[PDB]
């Protein structure tokens, strides 16, 4: 495994070895607004991240993940399209080198600066590995991010980032509440999909927030400062580290509001 985001690495190499990048349920898409319909059929849906315990905040070389207590039922995502329970288990984002790109996700083609992907797996099949080996196994809420006034509740992920600049550092990451990165509504577009990085697994279903939340310029600029290299490596910024959109082919994305 050595594929990236680089030219000669990146997403259009990934199907040399994994095959599924050019699978039938690939992530991210465009989300055309137009066309995605209300379904009366989603049930409400329910974020209790309430009793959250954040751990430690990796850099792994591709983004950075704050990582969850995952051992119990603690923070929990229901409801919606999902039947049962999603363990809440890290979050990331994804980002561009300017503010104009970014997401994974779009929304009638267009790019936000980056997003964020809460990811959870169902607690039916016991372990995370488990889960991503089924089509049901993992719910990622995705929250797209624009540049304009600061997120208080992201500026403690902001300032730890100059302890985690290169690829295999942690930093211990506790007391971190991820209530609030949330937008005020829910409302939200769901699908079948993917993984947006190898091993590309068609195991996600996809709920993407319609409102984004904004971010201050000085904190996207701190994302754009950590390393996709190691320590001691050419300094390579962590930055377009996003795949972009893939066909929707025989899937239609649904919304939850009118
Ligand atoms: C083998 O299981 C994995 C591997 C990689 C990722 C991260 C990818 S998948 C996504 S959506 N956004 C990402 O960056 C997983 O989600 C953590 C799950
Ligand atoms: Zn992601």
């Not at 994994?18 to 690939?26: C, D, N, S, V």
């Not at 208080?152 to 730890?160: F, S």
Request: hydrophobic share 35%; charged share 25%.
């Amino acid at each position: 495994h050595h594929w990236g985001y680089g030219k000669h690495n990146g997403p259009e190499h990934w199907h040399k070895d994994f095959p599924i990048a050019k699978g039938e349920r690939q992530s991210p898409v465009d989300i055309d607004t137009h066309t995605a319909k209300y379904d009366p059929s989603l049930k409400p849906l329910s974020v209790s991240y309430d009793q959250a315990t954040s751990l430690r905040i990796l850099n792994n070389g591709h983004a950075f993940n704050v990582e969850f207590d995952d051992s119990q039922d603690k923070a929990v995502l229901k409801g919606g399209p999902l039947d049962g329970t999603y363990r809440l288990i890290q979050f990331h984002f994804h980002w561009g080198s300017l503010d104009g790109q970014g997401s994974e996700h779009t929304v009638d083609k267009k790019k936000y600066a980056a997003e964020l992907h809460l990811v959870h797996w169902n607690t039916k099949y016991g372990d995370f590995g488990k889960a991503v080996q089924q089509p049901d196994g993992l719910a990622v809420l995705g929250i797209f991010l624009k540049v304009g006034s600061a997120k208080p509740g992201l500026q403690k992920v902001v300032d730890v980032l100059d302890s985690i600049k290169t690829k295999g550092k942690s930093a211990d990451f506790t007391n971190f509440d991820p209530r609030g990165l949330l937008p005020e509504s829910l409302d939200y577009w769901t699908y079948p999909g993917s993984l947006t990085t190898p091993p590309l697994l068609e195991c996600v279903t996809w709920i993407v927030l319609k409102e984004p939340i904004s971010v201050s310029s000085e904190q996207v600029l701190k994302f754009r400062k950590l390393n996709f290299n190691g320590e001691g490596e050419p300094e390579e910024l962590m930055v377009d580290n996003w795949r972009p959109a893939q066909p929707l082919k025989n899937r239609q994305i649904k919304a939850s509001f009118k």
